[PDB]
Assembly symmetry: D2
Homo-oligomer: 243 residues x 4
Amino acid sequence: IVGGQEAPRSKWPWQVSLRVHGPYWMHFCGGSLIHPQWVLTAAHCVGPDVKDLAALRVQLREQHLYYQDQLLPVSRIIVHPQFYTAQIGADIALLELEEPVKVSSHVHTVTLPPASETFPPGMPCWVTGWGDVDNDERLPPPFPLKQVKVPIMENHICDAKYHLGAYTGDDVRIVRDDMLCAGNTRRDSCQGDSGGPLVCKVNGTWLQAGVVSWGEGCAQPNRPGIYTRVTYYLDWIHHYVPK
Amino acid sequence: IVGGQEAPRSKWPWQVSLRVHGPYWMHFCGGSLIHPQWVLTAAHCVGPDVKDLAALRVQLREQHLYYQDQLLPVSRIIVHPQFYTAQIGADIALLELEEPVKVSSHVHTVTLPPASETFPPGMPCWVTGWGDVDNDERLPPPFPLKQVKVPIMENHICDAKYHLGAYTGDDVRIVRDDMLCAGNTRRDSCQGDSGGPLVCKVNGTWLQAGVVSWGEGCAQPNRPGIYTRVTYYLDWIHHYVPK
Amino acid sequence: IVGGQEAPRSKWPWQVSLRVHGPYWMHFCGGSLIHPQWVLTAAHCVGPDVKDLAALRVQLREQHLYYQDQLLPVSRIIVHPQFYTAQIGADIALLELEEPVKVSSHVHTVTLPPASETFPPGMPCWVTGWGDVDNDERLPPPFPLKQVKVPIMENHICDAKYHLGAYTGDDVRIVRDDMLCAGNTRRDSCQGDSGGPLVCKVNGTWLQAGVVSWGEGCAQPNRPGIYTRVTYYLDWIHHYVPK
Amino acid sequence: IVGGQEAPRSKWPWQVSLRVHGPYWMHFCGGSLIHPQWVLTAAHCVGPDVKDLAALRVQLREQHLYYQDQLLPVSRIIVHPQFYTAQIGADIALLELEEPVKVSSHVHTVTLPPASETFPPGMPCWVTGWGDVDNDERLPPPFPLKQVKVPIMENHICDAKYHLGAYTGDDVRIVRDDMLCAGNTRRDSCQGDSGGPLVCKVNGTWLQAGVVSWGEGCAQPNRPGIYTRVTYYLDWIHHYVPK
Ligand SMILES: *[C@](=O)([C]([C][C][C][C][N])[N]C(=O)O[C][C])C1=NOC([C]C2=[C][C]=C(C(=O)[N][C]3[C]C4=C([C]3)[C]=[C][C]=[C]4)[C]=[C]2)=N1
Ligand SMILES: *[C@](=O)([C]([C][C][C][C][N])[N]C(=O)O[C][C])C1=NOC([C]C2=[C][C]=C(C(=O)[N][C]3[C]C4=C([C]3)[C]=[C][C]=[C]4)[C]=[C]2)=N1
Ligand SMILES: *[C@](=O)([C]([C][C][C][C][N])[N]C(=O)O[C][C])C1=NOC([C]C2=[C][C]=C(C(=O)[N][C]3[C]C4=C([C]3)[C]=[C][C]=[C]4)[C]=[C]2)=N1
Ligand SMILES: *[C@](=O)([C]([C][C][C][C][N])[N]C(=O)O[C][C])C1=NOC([C]C2=[C][C]=C(C(=O)[N][C]3[C]C4=C([C]3)[C]=[C][C]=[C]4)[C]=[C]2)=N1
C-alpha cells in the first residue's frame, strides 16, 4: 500500500493473507473473507496454471504478518475460466477453506455489492494489504496491515490516462469494462496487495467494489491502479458461494 | 536460445541486436533487417509506452555480442497501434534507421513471406538470437549468436496445449490467430531473443514466418514458444516499408 | 544460529539487538547487557571506521525481532584501539546507553567471568542470536531469538583444525590467544549473531565467556566458530564499565 | 581498474587472467607471467583453503576477456605459508602451469625487481586488470584490459591516512612493511584486479613492484590501494622459480 498508514486492529476484519510453502509460509497476495468458508482473490495470484493446493494456505486477519500465524488449509481453488492475464481481464478467483471460520467482530465476512451498485466518483473507498509501500520498496517488518483512501475515477477517464505517453491506439481499450480504477500518485495499492480488497462505505455499509488486480507500476502519473469490478462477476461467484 | 548451438558466421545475415543506453549499450532484444533502412522487431521490446530514440541503437549481425560493436542510430519507432501486451496480440513494431545499410553477403535483408504463404505444421524452421540458454540461465560470454531448428505447430494445437494444466476455459483463446507457434521441451527461444526472427526455407528462399513474442517459460512441457505471425501483418508493414 | 531452537521467553535476559538506520531500524549484530548503561559487542560490528551515533540504536531482549520494538539511543561507541579486523584480534567494543536500563527478571545483565576463569574444553555453553540458520540462509520471520548448546574446544585444537585443508603454515597462528572457539558441523553461530554472547553456567552462575566474532562460514567441517575471549579483555572493559 | 583507459594491445604482455570453472570459465583475479612456466598472483585469490586444481585455468594476455580464450591448466598452486588474510599480510602465491608457454613480443614475462629496490614516491608505476571500474560497478562487456597510472606513496604516509576517521590506535600498524601503497581518489585498482601486477619503469625496464592485494573500497578518500611488496618475498619466489 502506497500512502495511507497502519490500520487500527478493529478495521478490515475480512482482510486475509495468502501463503505459499517455502523456507517459511511467505505472503504473496491478499484476499478477503466473503463467506465463513470462502475467500475471494485475484486469479493471477493462483493461476492461470494449476497449483498444488498443499503448497497453499490462508491466514485470517492479522495486525502483523507472520507474528500470530494460524494457517488454514485450502480444499479448492476456483479460477474464473475467462482468465489468462490481468490486462486481459476476469482477474478473479475463489478459495474454499477446509473448514468454516468462526466469525467475530475481529474476523468476519465483507458484504458483496448488489448487481446494480456502480460506485460513482467522489466515492470514499479504501484498499488494504501488506504489499510494497512504493515501487520496488517492501513493507518493512514488523509488516503492519496498511490502509489507504483512494479516489474512484470513471473507467473512461482511466482508459484515456493510460493512453497518455503510449503508442496504443486511442480506440484500443486498455482499462476494460469488467475493471474499475482508483488511486493517484500518492495513494495506491502495489505488488503484494494483489487479490486484496477495495471497499467503499455505501449507505453506511461496507461493500467490496473491487479486487486489487494490476497497474503500470504504483502511484505513477497517468497510471491509476486497476481492480477487477466485483459487480461484473457476481453471477459467477454466487455459482459457488451461497447467498 | 534453448538447445541450440553457435551459428556459423555465414548464416543469419539479417539478425540484429537492439541496444538500450546505460553503463554500456546493452542488448535487450533481437530483430531483423527487412529493408536497408528498416528493422522488424516485437512491439513489447519498445512499447507500449513511448521511448526516447536517443537511448536506442541497432547493431547488425555480430558473431559475438559487444565485441565488434558498430552501433547505428534509429530515426523512428513504429509500434502497431493495436498493441498493449504480448498475450493480447499485435506484438510487432518497425524501426527506421537513420541511414540505409550497405548490403553484402555477411549482412543483408531477410525476405518477408507472401500474404498466402501458410507455413504448415512440421516445417523445419529456425529461430536465432543471443537470449538465455534456459529459464533464468543467461547466455555466457563471449555471447555467441545462437540458432536452433524448431518445429512449427498448428495454431489450434498450441492453443490446446496451453490449456493443459490451466484454469482457462478450453473455449477461451490463449494462442490467438495473429500468433504462430513453434518449439518443444528441448528447442525454443528465450528471454533476450524477443523481437528476433523465426525463418523457414521455402522454395529455396528464407522467409520470416514469425517474430519471437512470448511464452510460459522456455521449452516447458506443453508450453511451445509463441511468435507473432508475420503474414498477418504484411499490409501494416507495407504501409511503411517499401516493397 | 545454526542447529538451534527458539529460546524460551525467560532465557537470555541480557541478549540485545543492534539496529542501524535505513528504510527501518534493521538488526545487524547482537550484543549483551553487562551493566544497566553498557552493552558489550564486537568491534567489527561498529568499526574500525568511526560511525555516526545518530544512526545507531539498541533493542533489549525481544522474543521476535521488530515485533515489540522500544529502541534505545546510544551515547558512545568504544572500540578497542587494537582492533582492525576480526582475524587479527581485539574484536570487542562497548556501547554506552544514554539512559540506564531498569532491570527485571525478564531484562537484566549477564555476569562477566573472573580473570582466572578458563572454561574447560567440553563445558556446555550456549550462544544466542537472530543470525542466519545456516550459510547464506536468513532467519525467517517472525524472527525468533534462537539458541544452541555448543561445545567449547581448546584453543590449540581449533587453531589446528583451521589449518586442515589450508595452505597456512602449521606454526602460523590463525586462532589467536585472545580468541576462544566452540561448535561443530551441527551447532554454530552465524552472520547476524556477531557481537552476541557465548555464555556458560559456572557453579549455578551464567558467565559470558565469549563474543561472537568470526569463522569460515557456519558449522563447516574443521571450521569451529571463533569468539573474542572476554577474560582476555576484562581490564579494558573495567576501564569503562564500573564494577 | 578505476580511472584508467583501455590498454594498447602491445602493452602489459605479462598480464594474466585467472579462471574458475562454473557455467563458463569466469575471471576472478589477475596474475602475471614471471617465467615461461610460472604465474605470480595474490594468495587470497586462491587461498587460504586448498583448492581443486581442476577447477582452475589460466588465460594469457588477451585484449578482451572471454573473446579469444585458450585456457591453460595448472599443475601446482603454491601459497605463502604465512598467509591467511590480505590485511595480515604475505598476500602472494604461485601457479605452476602444466607446460611452458612460448613467449613472444605480445606475450612474455615481467621482470622482478632486485632485492634492494624501494620504489620511491612519484616515479610512475601502472596497475592493470579487468576488475571493476569503480565501487560495485563491473567492467562492461567486451571487457577490455584497462591500465592506469597510480602515484606511489611511502608506507608510513598511507598508514596514517588509514588511521584517519578510524578507531584503530595510531601505533597499531595497518599498512604493513611487506606491503606497498599507490593510487588516489581518481586512480586505483578494484575488485577483480587482485593478484594483478603493479609495474614501474625504472632505468628503462619494467619491474613488478607489487601485487594488487586489498583496500577499503576503491579510490576512496584517505584509503589508497594496498599491494603486496614483491621485493619482500623475492627469496620465497626463487625457492620455486628459476632464473
Ligand atoms: C499484485 O500485488 C499487483 C497489483 C498492483 C496494484 C497497482 N495499484 N499486480 C501485478 O503485479 O500484476 C501483474 C499482472 C501482484 N503482486 O504479485 C503479483 C503476481 C504474482 C502472483 C502469484 C505469485 C506466487 O508466488 N504464487 C505462488 C502461490 C502458489 C504457487 C505460486 C504454487 C503452488 C501453490 C501456491 C507471485 C506473483 N501480483
Ligand atoms: C523475450 O525474449 C521473451 C520471449 C520468450 C520466448 C519463449 N519461447 N518474451 C517475453 O518475455 O514476453 C513477456 C510478455 C523478452 N525478453 O524480455 C522481454 C521483455 C522486455 C522488453 C523490453 C525491455 C527493455 O529493456 N526495453 C528498453 C527499450 C528502450 C527502453 C527500455 C527505454 C528507452 C529506449 C528504449 C526489457 C524486457 N521480452
Ligand atoms: C557476524 O554475525 C559474523 C559471525 C559469524 C560467526 C561464525 N560462527 N562475523 C563475520 O562475518 O565476521 C567477518 C570478519 C557478522 N555479520 O555481519 C558482520 C559484519 C558487519 C558489520 C557491521 C554492519 C553494519 O551494518 N554496521 C552499521 C553500524 C552503524 C553503521 C553501519 C553506520 C552508522 C551507525 C552505526 C554489518 C555487517 N559480522
Ligand atoms: C581483488 O581484486 C581486491 C583488490 C582491491 C584493490 C583496491 N585498490 N581485493 C579484495 O577485494 O580483497 C578483500 C579482502 C579481489 N577481488 O575479489 C577478491 C577476493 C576473491 C578471491 C577468490 C575468488 C574466487 O572465486 N576463487 C575461486 C578460484 C578457485 C576456487 C574459488 C575454487 C577451486 C579452484 C579455484 C573470488 C573473490 N579479491
